[PDB]
Amino acid sequence: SGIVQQQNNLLRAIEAQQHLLQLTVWGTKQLQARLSGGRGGWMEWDREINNYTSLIHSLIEESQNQQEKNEQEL
Amino acid sequence: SGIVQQQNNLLRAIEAQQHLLQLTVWGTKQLQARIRGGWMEWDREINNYTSLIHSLIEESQNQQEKNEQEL
Amino acid sequence: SGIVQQQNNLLRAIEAQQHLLQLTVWGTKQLQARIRGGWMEWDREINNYTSLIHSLIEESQNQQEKNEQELL
């Protein structure tokens, strides 16, 4: 199915962008150290990112499950 | 259908990833402001593609709704 | 169909998102190259996913086009 094949493509790109995104956050934090933010000034910022990250992994997780289920049924 | 349902998750991922990215964007500009390089142009690129993404996410929400109301 | 138009929407949302990512990587590079460095591996990691994402994107473009020409 070209439609089902496209979903897989979109999901994949999203997963790859998630790595890229996590690589960019890491890079940003390294800069933050050397530099200097305000001591704890970025705590909530960091917290918000972990919230989205966790949500994202969750969604990707459900999507991968839905992907296998759409490939057998549809 | 499982396709529309999944497309919803994909969209929420894109949206969550988008918000995540915007946080990265804010942080970087904070960093740059605490410091050459021609950053106003970069500023322009950010804004443009930020506009574009917002437009795309909004239109995806609209279609998602239309699809969930049709399938 | 509404489905194929949604994939067209999601694909572009991903394309646009890719630019912001590359731009944020860019700014990071300028700042990092201003302030050894465990970055050598960060750079290798970046290039890898960038190429993969551009590969996934164009692949999706090929698919998007094919699905639309058959009116799915």
Closest by Cα among B36, B1, B21, B54 to A18: B21
How many other CB atoms are found less than 10 A from the CB of residue C21?
Answer: 23
Q: Tell me the chain C residues in contact with residue B24 when contact means C-beta distances shorter than 8 Å.
A: 24
CB contact under 8 A, C32 and A27: yes
Kindly list the structural domains of chain C, giving each domain's residue range(s) and its CATH number in brackets, ordered by start: 1-72 (1.10.287.210)
List the subunits that have 3+ CB pairs under 8 angstroms with C. A, B
Of the candidates C34, A30, A28, C32, the one whose C-alpha atom is nearest the C-alpha of residue B36 is C34
> Inter-chain contact C24–A24, Cβ cutoff 8 Å?
yes
User: A–B: how many Cβ contacts below 8 A?
Assistant: 76
CA distance C29 to C38: 13
Contact partners of B by the rule of 3+ C-beta pairs under 8 A?
A: A, C
**Between A and C, how many CB-CB pairs are < 8 A?**
78
CB-based contact (8 Å) between B16 and chain C?
A: no
Which are the contacts of C21, defined by CB distance < 8 A and separation ≥ 6?
A17, A20, A21, A24, B21
| Residue C13 with chain A: CB contacts under 8 Å | none
Query: What's the Rg (C-alpha) of chain C?
Result: 17
Q: What is d(CA C72, CA C66) in angstroms, rounded to the nearest whole number?
A: 9
User: Subunits touching A (CB < 8 Å, at least 3 pairs)?
Assistant: B, C
Determine the Cα–Cα distance for residues B36 and C61; give it in Å rounded to an integer: 38
* CB-facing half-sphere around the CA of B32: CA atoms within 13 A: 19
- Work out the angle at residue B47's Cα, subtended by the Cα atoms of residues B41 and B48, and round it to the nearest 5 degrees: 90
* CB-facing half-sphere around the CA of A45: CA atoms within 13 A: 19
Give chain A positions within 8 Å (CB) of B12.
55, 59
- Residue B53's nearest CA partner among C14, C40, A13, C8 is C14
DSSP secondary structure of A43-74: HHHHHHHHHHHHHHHHHHHHHHHHHHHHHHH-
User: Which one of C5, C22, C24 would you mutate to disrupt binding with A, by most A Cβ within 10 Å of its Cβ?
Assistant: C24
Closest CA to C64 of C10, C8, C12, C16: C8
Q: How many CB atoms lie within 10 A of CB A43?
A: 11
Cα C17 from Cα B19, distance rounded (Å): 11
Of A4, A36, A63, the CB nearest to B13: A63
What is the C-alpha radius of gyration for chain B, rounded to an integer number of angstroms? 16
How far is residue A9's CA from residue B12's CA, in Å, rounded to a whole number? 16
How many angstroms separate the CA atoms of B55 and B31, rounded?
28
